[PDB]
């Protein structure tokens, strides 16, 4: 539970950093709706999980970069889901 459970860490770091950077990246862009920390976080979680609702997303270029970083380091990082392979015990 150390090799996997450790990923949960990385995930929470990404989710967090992603929210901050996203808001940072998106503000100043007319129409951007990804401009407040809280939902900025709701977004990152729905991006990492890739649930994909489409209720929030980036419009700027860096916003999309932060996005891609979150998706990659996030879909990967969701190796936490595999970590819950302990339900096979």
């Amino acid at each position, epitope marked *: 539970w150390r090799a996997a459970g450790a990923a949960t860490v990385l995930l929470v770091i990404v989710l967090l950093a992603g929210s*901050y950077l996203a808001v*940072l990246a998106e*503000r*100043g862009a*007319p*129409g951007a709706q990804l*401009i*407040t*920390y809280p939902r900025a976080l709701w977004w990152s979680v729905e991006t990492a999980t890739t649930v994909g609702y489409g209720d929030l997303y980036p419009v700027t270029l860096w916003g999309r970069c932060v996005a891609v970083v979150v998706m990659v380091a996030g879909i990967t990082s969701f190796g936490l889901v595999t970590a819950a392979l302990a339900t096979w015990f």
Partner: antibody
Amino acid sequence: QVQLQQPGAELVKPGASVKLSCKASGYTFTSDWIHWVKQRPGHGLEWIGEIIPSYGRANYNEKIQKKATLTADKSSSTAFMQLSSLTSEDSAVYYCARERGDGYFAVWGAGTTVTVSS
Amino acid sequence: DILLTQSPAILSVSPGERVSFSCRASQSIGTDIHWYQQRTNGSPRLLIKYASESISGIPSRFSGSGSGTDFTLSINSVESEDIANYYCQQSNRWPFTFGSGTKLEIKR
């Protein structure tokens, strides 16, 4: 205790420029945004721009003509708005406010009355 | 950018009565609307945030309602201390915007 301290007044001659201030106190985070709002006598509030001191980035209202340049100073917890080449039009009260990145302005400054006259 | 329509501009109510100021968005903004009070020569003062959420230090006389594009700030039993200018402000889409304003006016 009072959280945002703004100089009550500032006189300026047309074409000249003044650098307003706003010193903070109380709780501070890296998620804090300091905004500036212009208000001419009689009329309502007008967002001018915003800045994130814990990074330094600032965005400005694109509808109005840009007459300002925001800056901050982490240590002294002071935000500075530089208004350049002023005219009668620029005379008004300017408030600075603190926004916790959640969208609303919880606390505001007393505002600095600014007059552009000879 | 989002437009906040505040009409009527002036509201005339009798003491103790209930008063309602309305703010309409040019587009659906969920509940990202916030209310401020500003008395003659004072600075703005957060009254209600996120349309309904209360604020400490504010009379329970004050309340909010609405979602999308139609919002209402209410006062139960107005009174002299309530005479001011009320503004609505949104944080749904950048850049934040303000309502034109609505002056309360008590008739005694």
